[PDB]
Design an enzyme around this catalytic site. Structure first.
Site, short mmCIF file in Angstrom:
data_model
loop_
_atom_site.label_atom_id
_atom_site.label_comp_id
_atom_site.label_asym_id
_atom_site.label_seq_id
_atom_site.Cartn_x
_atom_site.Cartn_y
_atom_site.Cartn_z
N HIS A 287 0.84 -1.22 0.00
CA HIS A 287 0.00 0.00 0.00
C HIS A 287 0.87 1.26 0.00
CE1 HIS A 287 -0.48 -0.44 4.56
NE2 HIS A 287 0.09 0.71 4.40
N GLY B 215 2.19 5.50 10.55
CA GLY B 215 3.58 5.27 10.18
C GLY B 215 4.13 3.93 10.61
N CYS C 182 3.02 0.84 9.76
CA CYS C 182 2.95 -0.21 8.75
C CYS C 182 4.36 -0.61 8.33
CB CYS C 182 2.15 0.25 7.54
SG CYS C 182 0.45 0.71 7.94
#
Ligand SMILES: CC(C)(C)NC(=O)N[C@H](C(=O)N1CC2(C[C@H]1C(=O)N[C@H](C#N)C[C@@H]1CCNC1=O)SCCS2)C(C)(C)C
Ligand SMILES: CC(C)(C)NC(=O)N[C@H](C(=O)N1CC2(C[C@H]1C(=O)N[C@H](C#N)C[C@@H]1CCNC1=O)SCCS2)C(C)(C)C
Lengths: 300, 300
Positions: B41, B143, B145
């Protein structure tokens, strides 16, 4: 979102853990620069645990009576010294992995992470609070003495604890990194016991604020309270009296949620007086007190 | 003695964390050998979060559209590839701190440690269980991920998890290190929700054994039960059915304490049917299910 009993990353400390052996006793040591730190009971004989004289025990030792091993590399001891309840062993080699570090003596109620080690090898990491009775509810097995507790501010490791012994109640006692025991404990087999513990009030309030930050408001109420009236109630449940210093520390959390500290105190007074009514707060059915206001801000 | 929610030492993983930026999106990556792993993503644009076509999005990118930073030095992306829901960024520099590692896909009920990082920097570590509904009750902010979950066998890190997204219920979803989501979740903003969760029965029993090892026997009884009768009761409390495989796994803990698995099941049956009666087990007012039988043995 979410809220966890979170510990500091442990790599900066892992690179400092060594095995220290003297006679028939093996435990862990902390290797910073060219000095290895370890509990002084490493020189206590298995027949002299009742009233050892460490000054005599150490003067009778030479450098070749201390074997220090970093991984599979033996370090040569080139000198030794005692500081309160810890030994300092000078070695030929400075640890190239030494982080920026401090030695800090902490107040009761503050938290730190513990790196549990055996024979110089880390096994796990967990978060503790220094209890008001100066013990910690840790997790230590045989050979774990010399494991250390610490905090990391930015890139500096502030060492605040080294494990020495387990008390008859199943709790643990130890020293700062300069060898000074927390609480009234001594490193010999006399009659010792943890004092009556108390619940860390300012940490419970910090944790209730953490719950509000994470969208969990069921326990609040329309009421408020004075600091003195709160303390009258809190003491009945064996809570530390709440100080104005604690109120001021909770300021930033109050500002984030819009809930005045004394309003959150009224919420806690209701929780103490009536219970949780079968509900949970942040997944707990009891009032958790091992999160400081600084832990809450850092994680949230 | 004592018993803590203990995570694995994190140094081997800390040395593998990097920052990955593409467009205006920043998240974390895992740098092993000459490949950096990160959620796909990272190339999902704002306003294309509803139905992005990642095959179409990636072909529109060049190597120079991916910025990877290790510490404060840039790595040069020299090739890219998609594998299910993660990106692989091949770089000019091989990570000298790469540990021995595996990529492992885990079953629900297993536990792992999570190293929470932001902008390539570890912030903390905690222990999680893969819930039966394939979510994890973690702690992740914006932040985060690309942070990873892992176990350590001896010196080998088994990476089992990489964080991708938060579900509307406050729980987290992610993938193995080959990009395959746990549970029925996809990296696009369509209506998704955690399914009905269940309590990990074999872990509660393991944890009750841990309590016995550490001196808590108040919850035991003289009763026993059949596996089928136990499952009939446990299902009424939204617990996983207990299998013979689970009973066999609890074997070593039964041997250490002398309490037959089915006797401990009768003890848990009583606890579910009556509650804890104001008492605690290992400091908890709830039945804890985030310790596997393997975790109990490791910590005991
Ligand atoms: C003094 C007092 C009466 C208060 N209790 C004790 O003597 N306790 C012992 C104790 O821990 N000792 C004894 C000394 C050393 C230290 C130790 O080696 N303890 C293991 C370390 N390594 C780690 C213990 C074991 C599990 N949990 C721990 O942490 S300290 C005094 C001079 S010898 C027991 C072994 C727990 C009985
Ligand atoms: C799909 C569903 C409706 C089920 N949920 C969501 O859309 N959730 C979002 C989500 O997590 N997204 C959006 C995508 C990426 C990913 C993300 O950037 N998640 C952060 C990363 N880094 C870290 C989040 C922030 C809070 N805690 C976390 O862990 S996935 C879809 C295509 S873009 C929210 C940001 C939480 C609204």
């Amino acid at each position: 979102s979410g809220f966890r009993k979170m510990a500091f990353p442990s790599g900066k400390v892992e690179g400092c853990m060594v095995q220290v052996t003297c006679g028939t006793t093996t435990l862990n040591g902390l290797w910073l620069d060219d000095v290895v730190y370890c509990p002084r009971h490493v020189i206590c004989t298995s027949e002299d645990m009742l009233n050892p004289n460490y000054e005599d025990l150490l003067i009778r030792k030479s450098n070749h009576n201390f074997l220090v091993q970093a991984g599979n590399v033996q370090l040569r001891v080139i000198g030794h010294s005692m500081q309160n309840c810890v030994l300092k062993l000078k070695v030929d080699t400075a640890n190239p992995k030494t982080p920026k570090y401090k030695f800090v003596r902490i107040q009761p109620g503050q938290t730190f992470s513990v790196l549990a080690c055996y024979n110089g090898s880390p096994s796990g990491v967990y978060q503790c609070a220094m209890r008001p009775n100066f013990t910690i509810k840790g997790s230590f097995l045989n050979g774990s003495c010399g494991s250390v507790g610490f905090n990391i501010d930015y890139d500096c490791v502030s060492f605040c604890y080294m494990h020495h012994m387990e008390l008859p109640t199943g709790v643990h006692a130890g020293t700062d990194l300069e060898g000074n025991f927390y609480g009234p404990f001594v490193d010999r087999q006399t009659a010792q016991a943890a004092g009556t513990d108390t619940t860390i009030t300012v940490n419970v309030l910090a944790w209730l604020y953490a719950a509000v930050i994470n969208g969990d408001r069921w326990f609040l109420n329309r009421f408020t309270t004075t600091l003195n009236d709160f303390n009258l109630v809190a003491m009945k449940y064996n809570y530390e009296p709440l100080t104005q210093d604690h109120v001021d520390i909770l300021g930033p959390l109050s500002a984030q949620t819009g809930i005045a500290v004394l309003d959150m105190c009224a919420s806690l007074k209701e929780l103490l007086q009536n219970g949780m009514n079968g509900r949970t707060i942040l997944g707990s059915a009891l009032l958790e007190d091992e999160f400081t206001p600084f832990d809450v801000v850092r994680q949230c």
